[PDB]
Amino acid sequence: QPALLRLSDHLLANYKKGVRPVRDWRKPTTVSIDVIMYAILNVDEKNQVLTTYIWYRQYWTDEFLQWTPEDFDNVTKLSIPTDSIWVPDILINEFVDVGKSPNIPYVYVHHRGEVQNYKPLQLVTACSLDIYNFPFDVQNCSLTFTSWLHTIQDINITLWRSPEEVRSDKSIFINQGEWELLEVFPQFKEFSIDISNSYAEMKFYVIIRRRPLFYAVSLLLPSIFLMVVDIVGFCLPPDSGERVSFKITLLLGYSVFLIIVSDTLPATAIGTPLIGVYFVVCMALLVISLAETIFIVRLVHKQDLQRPVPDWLRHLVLDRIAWIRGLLQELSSIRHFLEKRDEMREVARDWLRVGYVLDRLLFRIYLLAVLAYSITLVTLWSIAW
Amino acid sequence: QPALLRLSDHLLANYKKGVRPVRDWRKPTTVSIDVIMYAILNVDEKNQVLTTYIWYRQYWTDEFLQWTPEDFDNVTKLSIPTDSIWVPDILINEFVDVGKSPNIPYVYVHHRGEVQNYKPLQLVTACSLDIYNFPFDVQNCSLTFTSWLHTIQDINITLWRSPEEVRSDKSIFINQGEWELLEVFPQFKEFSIDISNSYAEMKFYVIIRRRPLFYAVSLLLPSIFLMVVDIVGFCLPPDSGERVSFKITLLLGYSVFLIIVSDTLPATAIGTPLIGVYFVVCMALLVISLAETIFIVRLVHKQDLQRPVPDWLRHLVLDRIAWIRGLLQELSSIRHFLEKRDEMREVARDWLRVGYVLDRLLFRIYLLAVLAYSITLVTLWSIAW
Amino acid sequence: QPALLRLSDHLLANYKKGVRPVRDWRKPTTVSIDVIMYAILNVDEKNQVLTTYIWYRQYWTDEFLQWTPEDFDNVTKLSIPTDSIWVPDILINEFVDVGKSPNIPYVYVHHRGEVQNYKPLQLVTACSLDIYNFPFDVQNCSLTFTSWLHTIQDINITLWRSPEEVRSDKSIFINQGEWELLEVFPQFKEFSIDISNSYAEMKFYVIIRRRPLFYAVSLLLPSIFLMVVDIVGFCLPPDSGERVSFKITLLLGYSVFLIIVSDTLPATAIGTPLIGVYFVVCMALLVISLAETIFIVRLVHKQDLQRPVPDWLRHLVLDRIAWIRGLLQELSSIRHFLEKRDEMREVARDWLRVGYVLDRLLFRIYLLAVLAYSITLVTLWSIAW
Amino acid sequence: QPALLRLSDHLLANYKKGVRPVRDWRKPTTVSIDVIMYAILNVDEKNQVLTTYIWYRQYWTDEFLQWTPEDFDNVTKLSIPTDSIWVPDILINEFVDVGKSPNIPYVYVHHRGEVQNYKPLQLVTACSLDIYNFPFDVQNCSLTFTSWLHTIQDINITLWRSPEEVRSDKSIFINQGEWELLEVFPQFKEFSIDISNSYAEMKFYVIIRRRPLFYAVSLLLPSIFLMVVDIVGFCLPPDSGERVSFKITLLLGYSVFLIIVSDTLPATAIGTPLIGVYFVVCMALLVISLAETIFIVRLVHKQDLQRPVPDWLRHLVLDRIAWIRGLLQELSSIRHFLEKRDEMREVARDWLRVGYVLDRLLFRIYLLAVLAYSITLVTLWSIAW
Amino acid sequence: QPALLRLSDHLLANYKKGVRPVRDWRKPTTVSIDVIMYAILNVDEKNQVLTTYIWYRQYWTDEFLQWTPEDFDNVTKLSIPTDSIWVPDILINEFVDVGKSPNIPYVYVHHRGEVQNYKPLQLVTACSLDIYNFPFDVQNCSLTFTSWLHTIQDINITLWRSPEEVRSDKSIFINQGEWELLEVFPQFKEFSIDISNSYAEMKFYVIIRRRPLFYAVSLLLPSIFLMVVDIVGFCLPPDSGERVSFKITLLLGYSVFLIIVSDTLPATAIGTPLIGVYFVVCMALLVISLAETIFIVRLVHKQDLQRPVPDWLRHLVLDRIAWIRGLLQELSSIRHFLEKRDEMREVARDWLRVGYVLDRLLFRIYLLAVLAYSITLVTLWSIAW
Ligand SMILES: *[C@@H]1O[C@H](CO)[C@@H](O[C@@H]2O[C@H](CO)[C@@H](O)[C@H](O)[C@H]2NC(C)=O)[C@H](O)[C@H]1NC(C)=O
Ligand SMILES: *[C@@H]1O[C@H](CO)[C@@H](O[C@@H]2O[C@H](CO)[C@@H](O)[C@H](O)[C@H]2NC(C)=O)[C@H](O)[C@H]1NC(C)=O
Numbered sequence A, B, C, D, E: 001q002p003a004l005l006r007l008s009d010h011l012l013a014n015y016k017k018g019v020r021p022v023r024d025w026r027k028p029t030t031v032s033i034d035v036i037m038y039a040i041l042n043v044d045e046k047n048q049v050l051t052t053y054i055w056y057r058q059y060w061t062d063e064f065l066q067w068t069p070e071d072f073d074n075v076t077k078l079s080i081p082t083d084s085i086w087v088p089d090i091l092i093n094e095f096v097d098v099g100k101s102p103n104i105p106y107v108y109v110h111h112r113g114e115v116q117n118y119k120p121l122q123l124v125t126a127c128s129l130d131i132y133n134f135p136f137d138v139q140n141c142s143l144t145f146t147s148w149l150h151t152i153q154d155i156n157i158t159l160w161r162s163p164e165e166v167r168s169d170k171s172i173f174i175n176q177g178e179w180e181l182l183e184v185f186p187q188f189k190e191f192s193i194d195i196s197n198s199y200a201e202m203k204f205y206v207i208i209r210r211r212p213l214f215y216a217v218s219l220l221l222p223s224i225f226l227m228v229v230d231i232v233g234f235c236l237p238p239d240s241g242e243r244v245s246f247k248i249t250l251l252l253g254y255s256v257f258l259i260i261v262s263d264t265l266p267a268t269a270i271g272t273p274l275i276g277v278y279f280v281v282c283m284a285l286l287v288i289s290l291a292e293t294i295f296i297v298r299l300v301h302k303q304d305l306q307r308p309v310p311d312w313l314r315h316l317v318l319d320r321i322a323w324i325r326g327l328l329q330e331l332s333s334i335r336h337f338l339e340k341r342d343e344m345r346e347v348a349r350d351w352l353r354v355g356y357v358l359d360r361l362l363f364r365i366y367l368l369a370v371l372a373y374s375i376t377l378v379t380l381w382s383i384a385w
């Protein structure tokens, strides 16, 4: 007689699979698991969901499947079709769709009754991701493995191995994607939503962090030269007039860019992602950059003005010192046509002087406002890094 | 004899699962349920659909599965494969796709015949969402649980617990997403589409509200500085000419933004979402802001005009008081070249005076139109909040 | 003996489900159906497909499942697992994917052999939608229910109820979405693609119409103020020069908008959706609005021109009446420098006169072209409505 | 005895369905098929895939299912559950996903053993589409029906009917979508990837063509008025200066449009779709249209130039003929201020003359370049049509 | 007796399929496979996933299915339903979703026990794609075929054929899509994540390369004329003023284009795709092209300046040589009005001279900077090609 199927006929002859198998019904049949996290596929923050590919193991002690290695030629391990035996009802509490994993048809058994189960599982799972510190984030995500039906009286869930070995386990991992995990933290919990019920749950605080080294040259790099185009915008002379239309073109251009960052960030109602304030401060800087630009051209244009008062003109002098035959009546009619016409040009030349001194000093105080603001952010770089 | 499977063989030997099980066929086998709402996954308003993750319970009294705790060593609870017994045919009337939930293989039984069923269920469900008060909305959504086939003669549906306990149940809930529910309202209904038929239905008026604290800084924040760019637009001098091209650039810029809000809002045929009118009033404000801008430059430009009539000029003076040898003929030819040429400059200077007084007064009445309009909206904030 | 399963064992003992059940094989077992249309989920016109949620009924006379209410305690209705009996092979000919409906496990039977089947069914179905009269359309869509295999010899398909009751049936319906149906028209058809074959088909001319009350304030409302910005565009003085750049900014702005309406409309090869011509006439109106703008500035600019000929100048006068010591040679050198220089300004002033009279008359004939065009469209409103 | 199921019990008592059924194993059981193409659902060229709804037929001679019409009351046709008999393993070699078709549960049998199978099938299939002649294309797509496992020794595949009847078969077809087929070409092939193996394959060169009557008014109609805005762009006077900003606005506007056509066209690496060159020639026409615009304003502006040399000025005259008391020293100081100042205006007037003659002649040679180019394309219309 | 099913009844009478079949349990039942890669469907780099259609083969020696060709009329090959026998548990370690392949119901057997299995399989698989050399890339992608459960004690995996024949196998392949493979490299590996376990894995280094002949005329062709519009931008005269607004329009236009290339490229955290630096160098070239444009107009404008100092003016002369009755007091008042007014025009004319010499020399050094930069890239073409 060929011996291997001789075991299976002897084993599975009366194994009624519709029983949580035990010798004594008071005893909880303890399942015992781990995870080995393989990769992080995608984090679509706008959908508040997370897809993860996880290698996975189980065993549990089965009373009924015990044999002896005698009379079957020293066989201690054996392969069994999964749907021909019992299985625990465990699944994760935070799934969105479980239809992506193939069903492993086969499991092992030992002669003590330790039936061993491996399977892969992918789950698009939903854990509350944090988006506050955006390019430097840690995602305290949670996978809570749970018997959906059975209680502590029926089964308990525990770990395969030492939780320290779960913690720093990077034995197989696809890095160089977007993400990278620092550890996986297991923890038992005893769950009871109500009275007279009690459920085994054992969470997995999987924490991952993002490599910012792509997002810096895709989001911080657009923001920096948007400064220097306006910085070189002040080097335009004020009297040209398109210097106003210069800024608004960039105010149009920055308006385009803030729409692009709008949908890329999720709709998370814990508040603004913190880089968005550092982002949104830039337009108000541009508005006051624009508010400077309108001010001098309201100040300086040929508008038939009044004269500059000397207290501000000495203040302009201080700021310059701080920043650095009755034929006569026809002939009199000629100068009378020009004694004001040349002078109204020079009254316009007087207010013209006021433009350039403000052009110098507001350029520095705009530049020193930005440059002192910039050094604050790179201190936040080394704190985030 | 091991005792647990001794029960299952004694129980399921003749349980023909193709029977709605009862001792007497007049008796309606009453199922009895609840919901425990876990999370709200997504509300895509444009698709008029809603995805919801719901923990769920059932029991019903089964006549045939009764045993005694005697002769089976005091066992009162026991696990059974679901497809080996009867099940009620209930499902929700408003689904779009039920393929996302895993099938729980196992159910409990008691020695009285109370077979107990738990399962999770996600349904992309379609209820008529309201979009009228957009950032402050309540969504009276409905889940109507229904035996698809059986009538009141066959089964009745009732609640597990007190409906008060269903009402304020936030025992497990993923908040800090977008949504948050205030209560879940159950209600029995007796349904009959026709005569000679009657179906048990028990609705669930699930109501949720949106946290506006993200949408305010993503939709109200763009709208406010679009005012102040035009507010500072009047501080441009009128004679520049790009002041017209200034506004149209923003009229172009606001035209961009209204397309962005178009697809974000659904196609709901109950009317405009009410914030859209408050949104669409802004362009007509900008048009009359533009209509001011064209008016003064039609009024003020060097066009070889007629003189200003004094009744409007005294009205301009009132508004200023309200807002605050035959060689002679060659020489006569010289002044004749200039007695009009200097004067036509000054006739242009006369209409130039009319521009700035209108520049002052229309600036206030534009500003006071906007500022009085703005205080109306913040009163609507505290009513919505 | 408990009596209900006593029937089922007596009934299903020898019911070989692999038989289209009849006593005599010449007799066609007539199935008999209806529809009760619940809701219209989505009409994505670009995909030429339609998703519809339909409640659905069947019966057919089964020879083999007859019993007597005697000897089974007056039981005339009974629930049966669907996969334990015969079923007809009907499905709809125009599906794209049938995987969204759950399988109802249960059906009724009567003591005459009328087995009754209810089930829901959703189908993304493909019927040739019409997009010609876009915001006011009726969609003569068709659902042709068909035995996929069996012929008229095997089965016939008929209606449950009177076709009048199918016609005006709005007993359950989710309105206030986008769509609304006026009626559902059933009709039998006898189908034969070839000789020696004949198939029962019974169509359903489901017709729905769209509530335009959202699309009017999302597509007609952008089109109307695009007129009045150019209408107020003529109130710009011609000599400014940005009046040309004014229009092209809107010609740029209208170019943006026609791309937005491009993908929103499907690729239907029956021709242009009829509102698109009314849409596309606007740019050619803007081009000739632009062609006016270039014409006057080609006419009016300081270009050292020739003089205006009086026949057009009297025509300009008619249109104005229709719209309303040898020291002398140094002194002679002075006027010779200015007798032309002042005159070439006035020759430019002469052509300047030609601009404003054309500015008046072309403004009216532009306005009267648009306003008379507009009253044509509102007559088409009351015909469409 | 009821006779119909009397056959089925007599027939299917020992029909072991795990046998490719034949009396003699050398004989290849020839299956025999056709297609009846119903509709073309979508051609997403960017995904290089094609979805098609096909009605489909089979028969094959089964040895084992033969009966006599005697002793069963002259029954020659009969319905059988598909999963209770053999089936051939055929499928198409170019699928992407087969999960969209429902499983027809039923098949016919005849008393000779001709079991007949009908089923529908939709396949998103991948055939190498051609995109070269874009709005006028023919798509030589291929469906190669293949026994996936069995060889020529086991089965052969042939056609049901005459291949001529397959060729012009438009008996049922949903036209008025986008596409329309001219014919379906079947052809047997004998396939062997290697030695000692041989597989029956029978292709289907399905060829379809596109109705261009939508794409012409969605892609050719934008291209034509983009010419005439620049054509009317030359009617702007050169000295205005925004005439340069005119063209670049359209150069910006055409830059927008070429991005819109970029993603609409696939990434097919056989080269550019041929209309794209006719599309991309337009920008280089606009660049040289712009290069004209910069040239004259570089030529004509008040820049204190040198004089025009008469050889080009007589060439400008040829092109015009081709296109059509010591008080004196104060008085001498007056003319010395103006003998050059009036002249430098006239030196600027001399180069001003050069602008308008080039404005005339370059306008024609731009127009005649475009108009002669346009008549080349309409000849390509009648060749494509 | 019909002989073919006589074998199947004799064969499958006691084949308990729940056994990894062998005579002696120490022997590892070696499976033996290959791949025949058919096509590459899509490479969505942003999702870091890859879909591939692969024809596939297996055999393994089965102990139990041996027969003799005697007593069954010389039958050496035979078709068997797959779910009626054993199967190995192999699958690929890098899948995302296996639900797209149909289940082939049938397999072959030989009289030695070589059961032969063919099936197709599509997998959206995840391998770490490289995006560095973007239009000229090679993708060292990996398919690691693995028994998910069984160890080296249970099964070993080997190749069907010689690995050289796998290497250059292009026997069937859909080219002319986007991709093309140069070879497929198989390699055995012996895998053990831990101690006391050992798994057969046999990788497939599938390497493919991209045909750049579409992406060159879709991404390199936009970049080249963006140079020459600014190259012709310097031919604008500086004094016009819109020459500044010229460049910023293209700086706006290039800002549009870099957003388009942003999402087309993935989020790969190995760094920037190398063409992006060659792309992003263009804006900084445009900024310094803009920085030239602001410089000369800051240098040249009528601003009532100081005089040019002769050391720079002789340097400007060097660069030009490198690039090429008391009536008198009324009359004195006349010249005093003009002795400066004409001179301040000429002081403005002096700085005007400085503009054009810088216009010549900066034009060359801008052009020679670009042209010498361009020849570096075409050397990188022939290295990449
Ligand atoms: C398999 O079927 C094909 C038909 O598709 C057979 O080809 C025919 O063979 C006969 C005689 O062998 C010829 O008269 C026909 O002209 C052939 N038709 C075509 C389309 O080739 C082929 O012989 C069959 N092979 C086997 C082994 O049965
Ligand atoms: C498992 O299969 C591999 C083949 O992939 C075996 O490796 C071969 O082993 C033989 C002798 O052991 C050598 O001659 C070959 O050169 C090896 N080939 C390769 C590619 O390594 C391996 O021995 C097998 N192991 C078991 C336990 O059967």
Ligand SMILES: NCCc1c[nH]c2ccc(O)cc12
Pocket: A036, A054, A055, A056, A057, A118, A119, A120, E146, E147, E148, E149, E191, E193, E197, E199
């Ligand atoms: N060769 C993969 C088998 C395997 C080895 N170690 C594992 C750990 C977890 C798991 O799911 C599977 C495995």
Ligand SMILES: NCCc1c[nH]c2ccc(O)cc12
Pocket: A146, A147, A148, A149, A191, A193, A197, A199, B036, B054, B055, B056, B057, B118, B119, B120
């Ligand atoms: N541990 C989860 C079991 C569970 C406890 N309480 C529940 C309530 C509803 C439900 O579907 C399931 C449950």
Ligand SMILES: NCCc1c[nH]c2ccc(O)cc12
Pocket: B146, B147, B148, B149, B191, B193, B197, B199, C036, C054, C055, C056, C057, C118, C119, C120
């Ligand atoms: N309670 C829903 C049962 C039901 C009542 N009337 C119906 C009509 C059609 C249908 O599919 C189902 C029904």
Ligand SMILES: NCCc1c[nH]c2ccc(O)cc12
Pocket: C146, C147, C148, C149, C191, C193, C197, C199, D036, D054, D055, D056, D057, D118, D119, D120
């Ligand atoms: N009434 C549809 C049955 C039918 C008739 N002719 C057909 C041809 C092909 C097919 O798959 C099916 C059919």
Ligand SMILES: NCCc1c[nH]c2ccc(O)cc12
Pocket: D146, D147, D148, D149, D191, D193, D197, D199, E036, E054, E055, E056, E057, E118, E119, E120
């Ligand atoms: N006619 C396709 C059968 C076939 C022939 N050679 C093959 C190689 C691999 C495979 O999966 C299948 C095949």
